[PDB]
Paper text:
The [name] respiratory SC is composed of complexes III2 (CIII, dimer of cytochrome bc1) and IV (CIV, Cyt c oxidase) with CIII flanked on each side by CIV in the core tetrameric SC (IV1III2IV1). CL is distinguished from other phospholipids by its unique dimeric structure containing two phosphates, four fatty acids and a free hydroxyl at the 2-position of the glycerol linking the two phosphatidyl groups. This unique dimeric structure makes CL ideal for supporting the organization of individual protein subunits into multi-subunit complexes, as well as individual complexes into supercomplex (SC) molecular machines, such as the [name] respirasome. A presumed advantage in SC formation is bringing active sites of CIII and CIV in close proximity to each other to facilitate Cyt c shuttling of electrons. Here we show that anionic phospholipids interact with positive amino acids and appear to nucleate a phospholipid domain at the interface between the individual complexes, which dampen charge repulsion and further stabilize interaction, respectively, between individual complexes.
Residue numbers in the entry:
A (entry chain U): 7 to 83
B (entry chain M): 28 to 74
C (entry chain W): 103 to 153
D (entry chain K): 1 to 534
E (entry chain Q): 45 to 146
F (entry chain R): 2 to 56
G (entry chain P): 16 to 251
H (entry chain V): 22 to 61
The structure:
Amino acid sequence: SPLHTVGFDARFPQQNQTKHCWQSYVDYHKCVNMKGEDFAPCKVFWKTYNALCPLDWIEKWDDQREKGIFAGDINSD
Amino acid sequence: VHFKDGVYENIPFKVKGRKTPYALSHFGFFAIGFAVPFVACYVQLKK
Amino acid sequence: LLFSVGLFAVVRMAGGQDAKTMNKEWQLKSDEYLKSKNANPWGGYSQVQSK
Amino acid sequence: MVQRWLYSTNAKDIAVLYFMLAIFSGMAGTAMSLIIRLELAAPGSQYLHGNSQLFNVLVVGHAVLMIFFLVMPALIGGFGNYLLPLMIGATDTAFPRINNIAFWVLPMGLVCLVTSTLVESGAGTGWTVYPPLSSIQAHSGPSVDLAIFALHLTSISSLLGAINFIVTTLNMRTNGMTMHKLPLFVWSIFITAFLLLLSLPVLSAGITMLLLDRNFNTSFFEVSGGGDPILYEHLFWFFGHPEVYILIIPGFGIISHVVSTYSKKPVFGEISMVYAMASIGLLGFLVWSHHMYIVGLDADTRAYFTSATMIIAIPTGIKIFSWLATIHGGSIRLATPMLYAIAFLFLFTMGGLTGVALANASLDVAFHDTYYVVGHFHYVLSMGAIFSLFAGYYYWSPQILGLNYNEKLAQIQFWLIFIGANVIFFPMHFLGINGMPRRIPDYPDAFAGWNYVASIGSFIATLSLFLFIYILYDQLVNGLNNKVNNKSVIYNKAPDFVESNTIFNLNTVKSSSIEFLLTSPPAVHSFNTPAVQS
Amino acid sequence: DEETFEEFTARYEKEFDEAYDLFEVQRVLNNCFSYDLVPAPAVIEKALRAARRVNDLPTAIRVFEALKYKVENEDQYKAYLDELKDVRQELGVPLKEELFPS
Amino acid sequence: TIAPITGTIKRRVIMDIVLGFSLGGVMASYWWWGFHMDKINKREKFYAELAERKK
Amino acid sequence: DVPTPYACYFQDSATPNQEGILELHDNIMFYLLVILGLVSWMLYTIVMTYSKNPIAYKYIKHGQTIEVIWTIFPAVILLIIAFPSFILLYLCDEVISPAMTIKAIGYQWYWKYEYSDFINDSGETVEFESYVIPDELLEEGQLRLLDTDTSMVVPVDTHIRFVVTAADVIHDFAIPSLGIKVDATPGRLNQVSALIQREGVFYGACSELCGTGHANMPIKIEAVSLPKFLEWLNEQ
Amino acid sequence: GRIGESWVITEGRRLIPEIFQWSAVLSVCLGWPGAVYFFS
Amino acid sequence: LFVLLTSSILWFRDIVAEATYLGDHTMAVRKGINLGFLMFVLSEVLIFAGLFWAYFHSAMSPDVTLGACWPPVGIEAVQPTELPLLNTIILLSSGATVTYSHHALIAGNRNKALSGLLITFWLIVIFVTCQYIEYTNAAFTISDGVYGSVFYAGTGLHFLHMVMLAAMLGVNYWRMRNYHLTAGHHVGYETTIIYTHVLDVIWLFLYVVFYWWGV
Ligand code: HEA
Ligand code: HEA
Ligand SMILES: [Cu+2]
């Protein structure tokens, strides 16, 4: 990471990033679990939920989805 | 209720008394000055 | 001031020893360990405090 | 005979009783703070076997006791109920039952807080009670509930006292007295009472909400359950900062009264700074949030908060220069009130300097929660409250008792507290620049010498408190001797090179009120006639 | 607000017309010397005659040593010397030969 | 016997404030400049090692 | 760097933001010292002159022109000292070309750090533990309250974000050398921008109450060469 | 006269009495470095 | 707790008894006690406002997780709504009919005053009975799993002030039974004239929301 991976902050420049991971993950989940063939439209913001967003919440959501019970206030559809 | 000139009676204590000529109550004040932190330490630990 | 220093001395004497570690040599070892590598800022100045 | 000291319908008995309670709380707090500093004199376990739980228990006891039972009760109650309705010409103050109820609900607070501090679990979160730091999981038992009840009853007492003062000012004004030219003390108490009336209810509501959370086990400010403790954090800030104003502004009024009745000259810009103090009271609700720069607010919000917090800081310097002009061109005497006011103003200038250094938001990132912030507020609160109370006592003891107090003992007392404060507070600059990590029972031994000198200063302060109580004994036992001889100061102000001995003898005091030449407190029926002024 | 200063002077003379003791002399002297204004020889002589209406030589000492040490005024001496010389020669109050050799 | 008087209020405060500002500035600036040149030489040295790290 | 006994100066700067803010604060405290000297000379000369003041003036009240002069002087002074403060805050609050991220969600009474940006071998995250060393465990080679179970490695010469949060109680991620300190609400999430410039070892602590074991919750970080740092993230 | 005696102290407050102000703060150097040398 | 409450009520009735009995009443004492009681009711109003704002502050939903968008859909707990609406509507009717019934009493002080006092007693008895019907098994046990118990807690804490309102009305009636509170230095009347005016405003504020909002 030679001082430049994603450039200037555009997703959310503010220091607080509370409601940041959910929006970055809902679109990825929608693009992934709809046909399972092509992920090109959602293949540009990987570092948004890989580095900018904590991976602990992402893995917790993945485990919750795997076990069939989710903790977040989301919709089934 | 209206018999206080206000020279020495304003203090909420009695100056008179041979057993306590402001010597026993004020020694108790001395004791209670450091009593509460000492007992607070003594309840859980040693001084 | 004299009462302050005398009472501090007597209460310190009555306190007794309460440190089985951190002697002068302990501090010397720690300072040598800290100020031997890892880009030392001119070797530091961490002198041992006192007895 | 006991109704005088239990059902005092007169304000003076309640004033002296509040003074006694506050001085008892203050001496207890000073002794236990000496114990704490002895624990922090050297790293390790020399007198207390570690017990970080106990360490924070006495730390919060220190903070809560001195904030809620030393600075508050006497410093406002005595001066208010002894001057505000007396100088205006009112015969007797109203609502004795309210004051008695406040007094008799106080021991509830004292006993409950003693039990809370003297349980095995105890509450030890410090002056900050923001959950889940103040959660019942760590600090179990009844300590939180007792602390909450003490908070509620103390808030009720202070609010009722402020209401009584406000109604006395609004209704019991004499016919011959304009409102615009009120003395600085009256306006100071007015602003303090209104700020208290607009600040205490918010903190009381927050404390009630926390009590409901702790009792009914609901989810308002806990992190689990979608809670926001930052709401109560903001409530506590909007209490404390106006509460800081509540603690300081009456001290400003007391210093103004002292300098006006001593320097024999008017205060520079008196009406202009009455208007400025009114503006401060009106705008204090806008600079309460300069501590939350790191919580995660927006950059624009940071800019607004910092702009407010250094745009409302000018009147401090305005008051400094106004009192400097008040002591300029006049006669200053080598009396204890002069030196107390001078030391208070100087150390307040350094405290405000440190605060202005803290005013910047960019520097706060590396400066917040460092040692500098705690050093700054210890500076301002310590000197302000302690020196204001000391000056008030040494300036008002012959006013309420009439028995003279030794000049030599007062001067040596001042020197002891002054040198202790300076030796404690000078190294804090180096301590802040190094980054001493706060609230650690076993701190790194690098700061051993500075901790030693701080302990020496604290012990100097404690022996100074012993000198205080011995001076009280000396006054009680030899007031007649002090009146007989010249061992104690007889007159507040020295004559000028214009006055003959007889003329000065029959014109000993030319002040703005009759209190100085009012005889030692008369019976409960005083000021039987209205005060006329032109 | 750079208010008028001769009004207080006229107050001094009207209280002189109502003067009843040395107390009024003390009050007017204190009020006059308190102001930043330097008193002219006319008002100084008026104050001197007010003090002498009771014939109190110590008050003359007071007023003369107050004139000698009223205001620094950038250390004005020669005017003070000549003024004290004339207000002395008008009546004669030799006192500087006693307290000075001390 | 000088009649025009009351012209001393203005300049007293002015000279006092300018003298105070000058004295405070000099007193602070002594140690400020000393400790600042100490810091600046230390920072130049640190920049030297920073450059030599990549050089 | 490391706190030292009887120190007289701030530790070596670790990020350009730190040096900038310390220099601007130095200029601010220069102004503060000169005005404090002003006030001190005022007090000294006034008391020295008036300890023997012959006459007490009584009729100087406002002086409206010069009054408004010293009333508008503090406003322009604070605006002058705030313009550099304004530009410094405007530059610091923004993030310019961040490179990678390190996260620290410490539990109660001890710290936990997360290196999810780097992959250990293939895809999997990097995570380790770090606990305080008490007096009993204080052997020959460890420091009391300054040595932890595992040090925190930092990528030298790399823009780094600090996505910090907590679990139960607010824990303060404090590194004085890097000029970074943010209180981490357990339910919230906060990130700041910084980058280390040199190689060195820095020590920190928890400047926010945790509980019974609040004191023994230190922060021990360090910096090494880039190949060594990459190798450490590879093996761990 | 009015001008010559005006500068007796007006310009004389920069070199005559500055020693008093300098000595009013001399306690720091004698005290704190001395304590540092004593302990260390 | 019961004996402490009885002791407090006994002290209050005793002190009003000496106030009505010792006489020596001027405008000073009447105005002072009226101002003090107005300050007390103002403090009660401020307590009401603070308690209302305690649950009102969830409007913009500034939370971070597990919710942050009221209502936090995902949990189906017991809804507090629709339980106390009968009590609040009957209290609204009583407030509407007594908005100036107290002034009618002070103007007339006749058999119409007796009828007003009797209907006030009957309505407060009905209110306390309808509060007492759901005492233990109202919604559930308050031990765990809180999602919508805040409205119930608010109603429970608000009922207390109505309880002492009924208590003060009863003690006033008993004071009239003791032949002490006549049309002289009246203390019950001087407060009950403005009691409805200071009570209806805050209760309407608490009823327009907290019952039509947050469901
Ligand atoms: C009201 C403000 C105030 C004042 C005056 C003080 C005064 C002092 N404080 Fe404290 N302090 C706080 C407010 C204050 N403090 C707060 C908010 C905290 C943080 C709380 C925490 O987080 O829990 C704190 C914390 C705090 C700590 C941190 C605790 C730790 O973790 O170990 C320490 C450390 O030693 C300390 C020390 C001192 C000392 C030595 C004084 C000395 O100045 C004491 C000297 C005081 C006296 C001189 C009293 C004299 C007594 C009298 C008898 C009065 C007589 C007067 C008359 C009635 C006439 N304070
Ligand atoms: C006596 C009460 C008092 C006073 C007067 C002040 C004065 C000031 N305080 Fe402070 N402060 C506290 C009480 C006080 N403070 C307390 C208790 C805290 C701790 C709370 C918490 O953070 O936990 C605190 C903490 C605190 C912080 C918290 C730091 C952080 O975020 O963690 C900040 C930050 O901005 C701050 C700012 C200021 C400022 C700008 C002033 C200024 O108003 C000072 C005014 C004085 C001057 C103006 C200097 C002298 C005059 C001049 C030289 C005139 C010319 C100069 C200028 C106009 C620029 N204060
Ligand atoms: Cu503020």
